[PDB]
Design a protein around this ligand. Structure first.
Ligand SMILES: Nc1ncnc2c1ncn2[C@H]1C[C@H](O)[C@@H](COP(=O)(O)OP(=O)(O)OP(=O)(O)O)O1
Length: 309
């Protein structure tokens, strides 16, 4: 009684019992469900397997201070908006900057922003906003800031239940609503034990290295390791460039990928897309595509095919 056919026989018994991707073969490039939201990072998009954050899924983006977490999230908001979506930001950090947001594609003016007082009020006005079935994406700034009713008033219990409760009720909510929920986490190098088991995707955003280009510093090179993923196979990672005051670099992203995929070449550190050269050094080819969007288009259109959709 053949293993191969005796494995899938039962391995299939599992999905049917515990969900879609409860058991995946790290090798499979399967792709049966989409309605995903581009993260504006072609590299991270593919690393996700479904070319973006699955909608209707609770997502967690954790990492140290100044890693790129929120930038990605706002980048998520930018797209879900630019496609006729309604985005809500449950600010509890009071740090969000419109000026930087708007410069990334966020229709600030028409962005719902609620500034809770208690961790409970936050998780409510959020779970409640989700139920209205109007939102497409909702991101919550600072899982840390979500402090309970008391504490704010006066070991003795924990907030980590405040998360299990609202998450229990809210996880099933956005499930049949199609509203993807981003939760932003932080520095340790609590309630994070409940979210770690609900998120259908959990990204680990660490700032791999500092971008310079001969002046002071512009942005940073960020690396993201999708450690949990129930839509596609996990453990894949991606890198990209985040320029100070401009966001993620689509242009420079097309290059990193362009070459890693053999569409552009590198003789003497001189990037060139078949026949016509771009320039020496990366920060210069980035400045090349930054002007001619046609040449960058076909390059974006060539990589779009080379991989899953
Ligand atoms: N308001 C802004 N104006 C200009 N550049 C900014 C602004 N906010 C952030 N940046 C740039 C410089 C930061 O080094 C870079 C990455 O920061 P961010 O992507 O905000 O990190 P982060 O999201 O991991 O930190 P946090 O824990 O607060 O979410 O974005």
């Amino acid at each position: 009684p053949d293993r191969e056919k005796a494995l899938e026989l039962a391995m299939a018994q599992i999905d049917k019992n515990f969900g879609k991707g409860s058991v995946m073969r790290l090798g499979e490039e399967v792709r049966q469900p989409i309605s995903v939201i581009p993260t504006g990072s072609i590299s991270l998009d593919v690393a996700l397997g479904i070319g973006g954050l699955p909608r209707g899924r609770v997502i967690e983006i954790y990492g140290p201070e100044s890693s790129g977490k929120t930038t990605v999230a706002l980048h998520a908001v930018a797209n879900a908006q630019a496609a006729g979506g309604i985005a809500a930001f449950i600010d509890a950090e009071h740090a969000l900057d419109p000026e930087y947001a708007k410069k990334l594609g966020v229709d600030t003016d028409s962005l719902l922003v609620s500034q809770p007082d208690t961790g409970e009020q936050a998780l409510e006005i959020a779970d409640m906003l989700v139920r209205s079935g109007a939102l497409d994406i909702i991101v919550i700034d600072s899982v840390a800031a979500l402090v309970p009713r008391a504490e704010i008033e006066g070991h003795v219990g924990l907030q980590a239940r405040l998360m299990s409760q609202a998450l229990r009720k809210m996880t099933g909510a956005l499930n049949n609503s199609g509203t993807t929920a981003i939760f932003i986490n932080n520095l340790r190098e609590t309630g994070g034990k409940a979210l770690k088991f609900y998120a259908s995707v959990r990204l680990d955003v660490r700032r791999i290295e500092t971008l310079k280009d001969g002046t002071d510093a512009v942005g940073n090179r960020t690396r993201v390791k999708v450690v949990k993923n129930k839509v596609s196979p996990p453990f894949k990672q991606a890198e990209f460039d985040i320029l100070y005051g401009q966001g993620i670099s689509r242009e420079g992203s097309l290059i990193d990928m362009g070459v890693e995929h053999g569409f552009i070449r590198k003789s003497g550190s001189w990037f060139t897309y078949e026949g016509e050269q771009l320039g020496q050094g990366k920060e210069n080819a980035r400045k090349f595509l930054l002007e001619n969007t046609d040449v960058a288009n076909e390059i974006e259109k060539k990589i779009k095919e080379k991989l899953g959709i």
